[PDB]
Amino acid sequence: KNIQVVVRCRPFNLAERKASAHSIVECDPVRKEVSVRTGGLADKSSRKTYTFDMVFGASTKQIDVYRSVVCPILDEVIMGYNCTIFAYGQTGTGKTFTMEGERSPNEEYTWEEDPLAGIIPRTLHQIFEKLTDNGTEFSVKVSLLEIYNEELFDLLNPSSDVSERLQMFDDPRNKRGVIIKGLEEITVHNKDEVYQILEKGAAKRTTAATLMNAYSSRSHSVFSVTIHMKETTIDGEELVKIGKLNLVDLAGSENNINQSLLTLGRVITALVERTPHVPYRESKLTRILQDSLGGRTRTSIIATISPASLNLEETLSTLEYAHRAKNILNKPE
Ligand SMILES: Nc1ncnc2c1ncn2[C@@H]1O[C@H](COP(=O)(O)OP(=O)(O)O)[C@@H](O)[C@H]1O
Ligand SMILES: N[C@@H](CSC(c1ccccc1)(c1ccccc1)c1ccccc1)C(=O)O
Ligand SMILES: [Mg+2]
């Protein structure tokens, strides 16, 4: 199966409006096209146009991303496949907005209902909605690690010091897999446990940002949720499934400070060019993503872009990068 690639353009922000920014991006959700105006003052007609698996314009809301992209992927996780979604694009374009989301200010909504909530919390909410006493015995475990300068931090660890480091090893049980030694995996017994877990993770990240330069823009964030499902149907026979979903928020594409982003590009180039050796081992991120990139996990990429003329070169870089990645084949479960 080819990696599926979608584009999400964010709306203008107040500073862009204040600077009287013009748009250089047109999205056509129906034709699944994004068309970028490239000639500035000089050449009013030149464009580059790309077709993707889906295209989300500035008016797309969090709930539309969920319904279109995540729901189908989560149903596949529930069938016991492994899936990955990662966000790629320049700092400021909405990777974290998309993957995690934000809380609406002054208290207006519950987390399960917040319209600014992104992929991670909606996914956790749906896992419990879908599975709960609906016949299956099931458990859910989460982990959240971040890669910065090729060091690995555990945002969910009971340790009060976020700087305490994890270590990665090959997994002798699983050919393309790693063991993250020290990684706290929290059993989430029900939906009413979700928020406090995410909240404490976010507070550890805020600390991390005070400790390390340009932390949030240089970091890669790797949230994983594993679902163990058990069934005893018609004979009394017992049929076990395990689904895993990785939700990944990459370093800003404008970027050992950068080894993982660099190596991901070299890995994607190797896969599309079909070159014989693919350098997964040369970074922490690509070791973590090995199975998602030419392996047995179903992968989707959300490429995030700004609409503003100012960001022309990086917007074009992001679209070219993401477009070629459609050519990568995985073979799920
Ligand atoms: N689709 C969107 N709709 C509304 N605001 C958005 C959207 N995407 C991003 N933003 C806003 O733009 C700013 C940067 O988003 P952020 O998620 O921090 O980007 P990144 O993680 O790619 O650096 C934030 O203020 C965020 O609320
Ligand atoms: N993106 C925000 C956190 S948004 C987030 C969240 C979502 C996924 C993982 C961790 C936190 C949140 C913010 C603040 C307190 C708790 C949780 C969130 C936003 C909306 C609904 C549910 C969770 C940040 O970088 O701090
Ligand atoms: Mg971010």
Curated annotation (Swiss-Prot):
Q: Where are the transmembrane segments?
A: none
Q: Which residues carry this modification: N6-acetyllysine?
A: 130
Post-translational modification, as annotated: A subset of this protein primarily localized at the spindle pole is phosphorylated by NEK6 during mitosis; phosphorylation is required for mitotic function.
**Binding-site residues, ATP:** 89-96
Q: In the record, what disease is this protein associated with?
A: Microcephaly with or without chorioretinopathy, lymphedema, or impaired intellectual development: An autosomal dominant disorder that involves an overlapping but variable spectrum of central nervous system and ocular developmental anomalies. Microcephaly ranges from mild to severe and is often associated with mild to moderate developmental delay and a characteristic facial phenotype with upslanting palpebral fissures, broad nose with rounded tip, long philtrum with thin upper lip, prominent chin, and prominent ears.
Function in brief: Motor protein required for establishing a bipolar spindle and thus contributing to chromosome congression during mitosis. Required in non-mitotic cells for transport of secretory proteins from the Golgi complex to the cell surface.
Q: What is the protein name for this chain?
A: Kinesin-like protein KIF11
Q: Which organism is it from?
A: Homo sapiens
Give the source lineage, highest ranks first. Eukaryota, Metazoa, Chordata, Craniata, Vertebrata
**Could you tell me the gene encoding this protein?**
KIF11
